[PDB]
Amino acid sequence: SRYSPEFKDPLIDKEYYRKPVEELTEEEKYVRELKKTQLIKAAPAGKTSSVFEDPVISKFTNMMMIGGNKVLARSLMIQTLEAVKRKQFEKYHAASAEEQATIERNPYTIFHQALKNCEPMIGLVPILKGGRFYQVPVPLPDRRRRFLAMKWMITECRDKKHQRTLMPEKLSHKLLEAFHNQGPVIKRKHDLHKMAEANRALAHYR
Amino acid sequence: TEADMEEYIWENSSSERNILETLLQMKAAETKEIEEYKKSVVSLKNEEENENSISQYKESVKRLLNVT
Amino acid sequence: RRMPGQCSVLLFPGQGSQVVGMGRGLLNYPRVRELYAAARRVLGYDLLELSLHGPQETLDRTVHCQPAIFVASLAAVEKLHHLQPSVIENCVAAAGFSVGEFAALVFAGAMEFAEGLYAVKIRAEAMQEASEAVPSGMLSVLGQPQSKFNFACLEAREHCKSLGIENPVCEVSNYLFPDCRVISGHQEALRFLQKNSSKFHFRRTRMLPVSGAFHTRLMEPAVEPLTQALKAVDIKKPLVSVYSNVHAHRYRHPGHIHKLLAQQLVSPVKWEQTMHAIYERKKGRGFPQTFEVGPGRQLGAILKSCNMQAWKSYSAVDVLQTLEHV
Amino acid sequence: AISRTNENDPAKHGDQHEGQHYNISPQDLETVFPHGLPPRFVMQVKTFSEACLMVRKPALELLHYLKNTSFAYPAIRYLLYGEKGTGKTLSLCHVIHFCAKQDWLILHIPDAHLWVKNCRDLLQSSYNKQRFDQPLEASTWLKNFKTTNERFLNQIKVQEKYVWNKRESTEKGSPLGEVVEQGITRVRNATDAVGIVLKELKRQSSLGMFHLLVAVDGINALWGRTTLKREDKSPIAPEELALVHNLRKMMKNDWHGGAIVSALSQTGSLFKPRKAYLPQELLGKEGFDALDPFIPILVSNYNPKEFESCIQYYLENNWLQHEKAPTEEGKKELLFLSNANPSLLERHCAYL
Ligand SMILES: Nc1ncnc2c1ncn2[C@@H]1O[C@H](COP(=O)(O)OP(=O)(O)OP(=O)(O)O)[C@@H](O)[C@H]1O
Numbered sequence: 007s008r009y010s011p012e013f014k015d016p017l018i019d020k021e022y023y024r025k026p027v028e029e030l031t032e033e034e035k036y037v038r039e040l041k042k043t044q045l046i047k048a049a050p051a052g053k054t055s056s057v058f059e060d061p062v063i064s065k066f067t068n069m070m071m072i073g074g075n076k077v078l079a080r081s082l083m084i085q086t087l088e089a090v091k092r093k094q095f096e097k098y099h100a101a102s103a104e105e106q107a108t109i110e111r112n113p114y115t116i117f118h119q120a121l122k123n124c125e126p127m128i129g130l131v132p133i134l135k136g137g138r139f140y141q142v143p144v145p146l147p148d149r150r151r152r153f154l155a156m157k158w159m160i161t162e163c164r165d166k167k168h169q170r171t172l173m174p175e176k177l178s179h180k181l182l183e184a185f186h187n188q189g190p191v192i193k194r195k196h197d198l199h200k201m202a203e204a205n206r207a208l209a210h211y212r
Numbered sequence: 213t214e215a216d217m218e219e220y221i222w223e224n225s226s227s228e229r230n231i232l233e234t235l236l237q238m239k240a241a242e243t244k245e246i247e248e249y250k251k252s253v254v255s256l257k258n259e260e261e262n263e264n265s266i267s268q269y270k271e272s273v274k275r276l277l278n279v280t
Numbered sequence: 281r282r283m284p285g286q287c288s289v290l291l292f293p294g295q296g297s298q299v300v301g302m303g304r305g306l307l308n309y310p311r312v313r314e315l316y317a318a319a320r321r322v323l324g325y326d327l328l329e330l331s332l333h334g335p336q337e338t339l340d341r342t343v344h345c346q347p348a349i350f351v352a353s354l355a356a357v358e359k360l361h362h363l364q365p366s367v368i369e370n371c372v373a374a375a376g377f378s379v380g381e382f383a384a385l386v387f388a389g390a391m392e393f394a395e396g397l398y399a400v401k402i403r404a405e406a407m408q409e410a411s412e413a414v415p416s417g418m419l420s421v422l423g424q425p426q427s428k429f430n431f432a433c434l435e436a437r438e439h440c441k442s443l444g445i446e447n448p449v450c451e452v453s454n455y456l457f458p459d460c461r462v463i464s465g466h467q468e469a470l471r472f473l474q475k476n477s478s479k480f481h482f483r484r485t486r487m488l489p490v491s492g493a494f495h496t497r498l499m500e501p502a503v504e505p506l507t508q509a510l511k512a513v514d515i516k517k518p519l520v521s522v523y524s525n526v527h528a529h530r531y532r533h534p535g536h537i538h539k540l541l542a543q544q545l546v547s548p549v550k551w552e553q554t555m556h557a558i559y560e561r562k563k564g565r566g567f568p569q570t571f572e573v574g575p576g577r578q579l580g581a582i583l584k585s586c587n588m589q590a591w592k593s594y595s596a597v598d599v600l601q602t603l604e605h606v
Numbered sequence: 607a608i609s610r611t612n613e614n615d616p617a618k619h620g621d622q623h624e625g626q627h628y629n630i631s632p633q634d635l636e637t638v639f640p641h642g643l644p645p646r647f648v649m650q651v652k653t654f655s656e657a658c659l660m661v662r663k664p665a666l667e668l669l670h671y672l673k674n675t676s677f678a679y680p681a682i683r684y685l686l687y688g689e690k691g692t693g694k695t696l697s698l699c700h701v702i703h704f705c706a707k708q709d710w711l712i713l714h715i716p717d718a719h720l721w722v723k724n725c726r727d728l729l730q731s732s733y734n735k736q737r738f739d740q741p742l743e744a745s746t747w748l749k750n751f752k753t754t755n756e757r758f759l760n761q762i763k764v765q766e767k768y769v770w771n772k773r774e775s776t777e778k779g780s781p782l783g784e785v786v787e788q789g790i791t792r793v794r795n796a797t798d799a800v801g802i803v804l805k806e807l808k809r810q811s812s813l814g815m816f817h818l819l820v821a822v823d824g825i826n827a828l829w830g831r832t833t834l835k836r837e838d839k840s841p842i843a844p845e846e847l848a849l850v851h852n853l854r855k856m857m858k859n860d861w862h863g864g865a866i867v868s869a870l871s872q873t874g875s876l877f878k879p880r881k882a883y884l885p886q887e888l889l890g891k892e893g894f895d896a897l898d899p900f901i902p903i904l905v906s907n908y909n910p911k912e913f914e915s916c917i918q919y920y921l922e923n924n925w926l927q928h929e930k931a932p933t934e935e936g937k938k939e940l941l942f943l944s945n946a947n948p949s950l951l952e953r954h955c956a957y958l
């Protein structure tokens with residue numbers, strides 16, 4: 007690494023600094039004073055104090071990226087968001103008066119809820135002890151399941167069975183399916199929760 | 213060759229022919245203006261084309277064509 | 281020396297590329313009417329009328345399609361020479377598929393029109409007789425990474441042995457591009473392969489509209505006739521590098537073309553090997569221009585499957601229409 | 607609805623309607639604009655279930671020029687120019703909608719760049735063996751021309767016998783619609799049918815039968831270069847295309863009774879840098895000589911009033927779903943990111 011150990015990661019949170027000194031606790035006052043002495047790394051290209059910034063969508067875009075072509079990944083992400091928005095508007099214009107109150111048109115809300123609906127809380131850990139592999143249930147950390155939902159969504163959208171259907175169109179369809187607890191990603195979560203319930207007797211190996 | 217030569221001569225030019233034809237047609241339907249028109253044309257043809265030159269040409273053409 | 285990019289490689293199509301309207305767009309070009317007149321003189325019927333306006337059923341016949349493709353290929357060569365003299369002047373390699381081989385040699389100055397057309401005629405007639413002798417056919421099979429071709433041919437032969445016939449024939453007849461081959465042999469074996477594609481891991485299967493199993497030992501009776509017709513012909517040294525189909529390498533000495541043109545009749549077509557031998561090179565180095573002189577665009581798709589980068593500089597001569605009336 | 611104007615009549619818009627959106631009816635949409643609107647504005651029309659155009663200074667000035675136009679003088683050439691995505695196409699659409707409501711005859715070319723690139727059925731004209739026909743591009747335009755000007759096709763009549771082939775000919779005095787039909791039914795004569803129409807419309811308008819508008823978007827294609835090739839892989843010049851050759855005659859001010867309005871476009875242009883937007887740079891010497899004399903009209907980015915009104919329009923259509931968008935900080939961020947460019951603002955708002 008080209009940064010010395012003294013260098014610390016920057017804090018881009020804009021409203022953190024505007025906090026009144028009166029609200030600051032003694033510990034928070036101390037750490038604010040301490041950061042004065044520390045050296046701070048240059049903020050990386052990426053996160054910004056923008057009010058429209060979304061770390062989850064940024065991570066999804068980075069996970070779609072191939073060969074460092076970030077422009078194309080962000081283009082695909084924004085196209086997916088626009089497609090979801092337009093599909094929801096089309097479904098809203100054609101809905102009954104009482105059905106328009108339960109139709110979400112915010113693409114960010116749909117994206118977050120669809121990813122949350124696919125998060126597995128339990129997983130397996132291959133462990134060979136007696137000469138034969140043994141899959142044991144283990145509770146998944148929050149970061150692990152957040153990553154797994156994204157990875158499953160992207161892998162499902164990268165299947166070759168979808169011939170000539172462009173990535174934004176496939177991803178919008180999968181997101182809207184997972185928003186309603188439907189589709190193959192929700193089934194992949196269910197088949198993991200079931201295959202980890204089928205081996206609850208193997209937890210004693212942990 | 214005219215390309216090698218560093219001058220667009222407004223005399224005996226397509227701009228002059230077109231404006232002469234247009235004014236003859238206007239008179240049939242019915243100068244300092246032509247001087248400023250040729251100045252703007254020569255500027256746009258020889259110097260750099262900026263929006264100031266474009267606006268000068270616009271004003272000259274409007275005055276010649278009776279557009280307000 | 282010349283760099284790759286101003287040189288040119290001419291590819292000649294084979295049987296299965298015939299089409300009604302073939303020949304239109306080439307007639308008004310120089311020297312084509314004389315070639316069709318020579319075709320009439322040698323054959324004994326009006327190839328021109330059949331190629332232009334035909335029922336497509338008389339044209340799909342083996343005795344009629346191959347000479348039509350031959351004459352159309354050479355007419356397209358004449359058209360290309362008229363349009364682009366430099367391309368014909370800067371020619372490095374030539375290759376034909378099954379019958380277009382006879383065209384490439386005639387283009388390379390190893391044969392003249394009359395002898396080549398006579399060879400093609402006798403070849404087509406003998407192949408038609410051989411196909412009539414025993415029921416047979418050709419099946420295009422597109423496999424996946426888990427597909428075993430020799431294995432599947434083995435069970436396809438076991439089926440016919442169980443039914444009971446003398447030495448069932450079912451082997452790969454054409455290597456076109458990766459994981460796609462053309463199997464040839466008795467219709468029972470091909471039906472077995474079609475109905476057991478799922479077990480054999482064949483993504484697609486399509487029976488070819490051909491008379492019989494070409495490029496197999498079943499065509500052996502058609503070897504002795506053609507040989508005699510080739511015996512009289514004096515084959516010269518090709519001026520350009522003409523590639524073979526039996527072993528997919530350049531013809532070296534003219535005295536070996538005589539027997540290779542007969543082995544090609546009863547040997548698999550090594551098209552993928554020929555494409556490698558012509559276009560193989562290191563990454564980054566330039567590729568030559570490619571011109572498909574003849575009907576259809578099948579060789580274009582095959583080259584696309586084989587080499588994308590070589591396919592980037594590929595173009596086809598239009599033998600159905602001409603932009604300008606010369 | 608501060609961003610909307612109740613005056614949906616383009617003939618009565620003035621400086622007090624600047625920054626306000628006026629509605630185009632579905633009937634006017636399908637009649638006046640089968641092809642004119644930009645591709646990404648049609649998505650907004652389909653999503654909002656309504657077409658609304660902001661009234662801006664370029665369109666107001668070009669409308670004031672067309673209201674005071676003398677129909678005895680030769681037709682005046684108006685050229686809309688500006689940076690990429692500044693709204694010149696929609697200003698031309700506003701002017702076309704104004705002219706249509708006053709029973710003008712509309713000759714609208716939605717994009718002249720399509721005629722000089724990516725043509726798969728290129729033919730050689732039987733009329734003139736040195737030119738090429740584009741039946742697919744000519745027949746597509748003929749149908750929409752028929753749609754826009756269906757009323758006049760029976761009032762307007764030819765003054766010559768046009769011979770499509772030895773069997774078929776259009777006799778003198780037949781309605782112009784027949785000619786259009788012959789171009790729509792048999793594509794082989796589509797390109798020949800377009801030119802005749804132009805030849806008629808330029809002539810009859812001089813007689814005073816009707817007022818003609820020539821609306822050519824992406825006019826810079828006519829005097830540039832083409833990406834179309836012969837069978838010998840040789841380049842083809844724009845003048846060798848009959849469709850392009852006949853449309854140049856309409857840009858010349860050798861006829862009266864109408865106005866010529868055009869808009870430049872680097873989007874889809876051939877052999878032009880991304881940042882070239884000025885008249886000479888995009889037109890070329892030949893194009894400038896052809897159009898000269900002409901009146902250029904500048905189209906710029908949104909001023910603060912227009913930017914605020916556009917964001918209020920999107921908010922009224924509930925098109926900004928992010929919670930921070932309606933706030934003031936989000937408006938500053940959008941203003942900075944787009945720099946008031948209409949196209950960038952629309953694209954950014956599309957996915958928020
Ligand atoms: N008057 C307007 N009313 C509403 N939206 C507008 C207006 N002008 C511009 N826009 C917005 O800007 C987008 C781009 O406008 P337009 O297509 O007219 O640009 P242009 O300057 O002609 O572009 P280009 O240089 O690419 O040809 C439109 O789709 C619409 O989103």
Ligand SMILES: Nc1nc2c(ncn2[C@@H]2O[C@H](COP(=O)(O)OP(=O)(O)O)[C@@H](O)[C@H]2O)c(=O)[nH]1
Nearest residue numbers: 733767768769770795797798801802805848852
């Ligand atoms: N098929 C056909 N097309 C015609 C006929 N007359 C004119 N046109 C077409 O309509 C266009 C009218 O343009 P025109 O005044 O004749 O200019 P020109 O081509 O130089 O002679 C021509 O370019 C032709 O393409 C005709 O009698 N038959």
Ligand SMILES: [Mg+2]
Nearest residue numbers: 694695870871
């Ligand atoms: Mg435009």
